[PDB]
């Protein structure tokens, strides 16, 4: 685990890694979404400002849908929505350790909008069910 086996993952270092090994690496890929322009005329009064506000809007877009699904602020959120087996006919042992996450996203690229919209439909129902049991 030392020497050649030590951990020096850095940024995006688990890109070609297995999903079990890359599941530990979600912490280091979050901080490099807003920084880099931490220290400082037509040119670059627009070329810098347009890209800086774009990084803000893309970050708040990812956080907001993470808030609509009801588990914002959690790096690994696992909700209570069943998934259809037609999207991927692979079990747990054929997903998490044999293939890289990059080609997996292309397999579920078509079925992204089905699963991204079903999460909030079972979250408003979850918040309505929470209101009935509370009172």
């Amino acid at each position, epitope marked *: 685990a030392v*020497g*050649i*086996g*030590a951990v*020096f993952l850095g940024f995006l270092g688990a890109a070609g890694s297995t999903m079990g090994a890359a599941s530990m690496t979600l912490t280091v890929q979050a901080r490099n979404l807003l920084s880099g322009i931490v220290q400082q005329l037509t040119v670059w009064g627009i070329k810098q400002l347009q890209a800086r506000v774009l990084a803000v809007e893309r970050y708040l877009r990812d956080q907001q849908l993470l808030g609509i699904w009801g588990c914002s602020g959690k790096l690994i959120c696992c909700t209570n929505v069943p998934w259809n087996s037609s999207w991927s006919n692979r079990n747990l042992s054929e997903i998490w350790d044999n293939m890289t996450w990059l080609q997996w996203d292309k397999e579920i690229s078509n079925y992204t909008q089905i699963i991204y919209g079903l999460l909030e439909e079972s979250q408003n129902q979850q918040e309505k069910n929470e209101q009935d049991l509370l009172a």
Partner: nanobody
Framework: VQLQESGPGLVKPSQSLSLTCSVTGYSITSAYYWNWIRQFPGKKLEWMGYLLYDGSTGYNPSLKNRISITRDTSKNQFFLKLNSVTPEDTATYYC?????????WGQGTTLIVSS
């Protein structure tokens, strides 16, 4: 990364041995482990110690207090000093890059400890 060892090729017994490893193409202050390894006559290897990006030091206990390892971060160089040398410490000294299942070695330099 490329590593190149340099220093005097002849050292008188009981005096101090100093070598420089010059590193180029990568910064040693955000980085992997940087080691010194030597090869004796008869082709045996013994690991002396390492360095980290944060300045922490580690040495083989068998070498006692005989070795201080140091660096200059402005020049991106790190250094070996070996006190109280003997002719059985004659060996070809390498400075090495190891990590992430990658291993890179310098070409090495020859040193003879004799009077």
């Amino acid at each position: 990364v490329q590593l190149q060892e340099s220093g005097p090729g002849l050292v008188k017994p009981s005096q101090s041995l100093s070598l420089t490893c010059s590193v180029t193409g990568y910064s040693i202050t955000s980085a992997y482990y940087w080691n010194w390894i030597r090869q004796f006559p008869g082709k045996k290897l013994e690991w002396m110690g390492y360095l980290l990006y944060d300045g922490s030091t580690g040495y083989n206990p068998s070498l006692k207090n005989r070795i201080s390892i140091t660096r200059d971060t402005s020049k991106n160089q790190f250094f070996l000093k070996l006190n109280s040398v003997t002719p059985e410490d004659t060996a070809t000294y390498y400075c090495s890059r190891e990590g992430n299942n990658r291993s890179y070695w310098g070409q090495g330099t020859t040193l003879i400890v004799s009077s």
